[PDB]
């Protein structure tokens, strides 16, 4: 029962406004979700995200009825607040750690140790995702135990990163290890190592076969260009006390608007794709120009 506080919860309503504002593209997502995976020419840095996206969009949407169910009834019911939203998140945090894994996994069918010996490229990566998760599970295991919380907030199953220090368990770490160190540290490291790896594969990088890797970091960084300061400054902000806190439900929920934000940024997984595609080609140049002259 988060009904402990006030009902209006003006912060949370604004998010509902977003959820419907975002739902409308969301409907595009089942269309965009299915098309790209079934689009043969859709196997870029996003292809990994598209498999995740179906899960991220499905697991989320399957759970979306629960979200209106959280406002329709008036309260919340289940363990869906952390069991779904933080749950899918944590994989999303880990996804980035894991993303290079998928890069090495997918390259492998292309360069080293291709599959087990006779198998599709896909079946492997699902199963690799399965092994990969397990190391990740151990990282996510603390929360099932005592880290973070299954505490409620407002009228929606929205979980976000950990609330306080909690040094016994270092719950503090979720903001720092999965989040900060999951993108920013390997991101710098890639940049450090990149000159090093370029030592042999300096320019050699045709198509998504190898180049994807530069792009991989770009797209995270592009995406984080926009997701980094709001999520960072939100997370810093809630933890930088003195500010928004007159109730956990609103400030813990509005902070969860961010859960849809990774859904919304995900549509870029189909825009940096045609763009990087378009970059090498040259017919694409005037193609975007084409309609622009005509406006219609």
Gross CATH architecture: Up-down Bundle
Overall, the morphology is globular
Which class do the helix and strand fractions yield? mainly alpha
The overall number of domains is 1
CATH superfamily placement? Rhodopsin 7-helix transmembrane proteins
How many helix segments? 11
As a percent range, the share of strand residues is: under 5%
> Biggest sheet, in brief?
none
Number of strands: 0
Q: Give the ordered list of helices and strands.
A: HHHHHHHHHHH
CATH domain topology: Rhopdopsin 7-helix transmembrane proteins
Briefly, what CATH class? Mainly Alpha
| Oligomeric state of the chains present here | monomer
The radius of gyration is: 21 Å
- The portion of residues assigned to helices is 55-70%
The end-to-end distance, rounded to whole angstroms, is 51 Å
PDB class: signaling protein
Keywords: G protein coupled receptor, GPCR, chemokine, membrane protein, transmembrane, 7TM, signaling, signaling protein
Assembly: monomeric
Entry title: Structure of human CXCR1 in phospholipid bilayers
In short:
The chain is mainly alpha-helical and 296 residues long. The protein has helices at 10-38, 47-72, 80-110, 121-145, 173-197, 207-210, 212-239, 248-254, 257-265, 272-280, 283-294.
């Amino acid at each position: 029962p988060c009904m402990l506080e006030t009902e209006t919860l003006n912060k949370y309503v604004v998010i509902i406004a977003y959820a419907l504002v975002f739902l409308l593209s969301l409907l595009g997502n089942s269309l965009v979700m299915l098309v790209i995976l079934y689009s043969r020419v859709g196997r870029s840095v996003t292809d990994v995200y598209l498999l995740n996206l179906a899960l991220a969009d499905l697991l989320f949407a399957l759970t979306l009825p629960i979200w209106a169910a959280s406002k329709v009834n008036g309260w919340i019911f289940g363990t869906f607040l952390c069991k779904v939203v933080s749950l899918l998140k944590e994989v999303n945090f880990y996804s980035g750690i894991l993303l290079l894994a998928c890069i090495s996994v997918d390259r492998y069918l292309a360069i080293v140790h291709a599959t087990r010996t006779l198998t599709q490229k896909r079946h492997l990566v699902k199963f690799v995702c399965l092994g990969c998760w397990g190391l990740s599970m151990n990282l996510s295991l603390p929360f099932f135990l005592f880290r973070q919380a299954y505490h409620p907030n407002n009228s929606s199953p929205v979980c976000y990163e950990v609330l306080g220090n909690d040094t016994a368990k270092w719950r503090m770490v979720l903001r720092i290890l999965p989040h900060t160190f999951g993108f920013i540290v390997p991101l710098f490291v890639m940049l450090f190592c990149y000159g090093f790896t370029l030592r042999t594969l300096f320019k050699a990088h045709m198509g998504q076969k190898h180049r994807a890797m530069r792009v991989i970091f770009a797209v995270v960084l592009i995406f984080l260009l926009c997701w980094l300061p709001y999520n960072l400054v939100l997370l810093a902000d809630t933890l930088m006390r003195t500010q928004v806190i007159q109730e956990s439900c609103e400030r813990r929920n509005n902070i969860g608007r961010a859960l849809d934000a990774t859904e919304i940024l995900g549509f870029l997984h189909s825009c940096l794709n045609p763009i990087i595609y378009a970059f090498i080609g040259q017919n694409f140049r005037h193609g975007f120009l084409k309609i622009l002259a005509m406006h219609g």
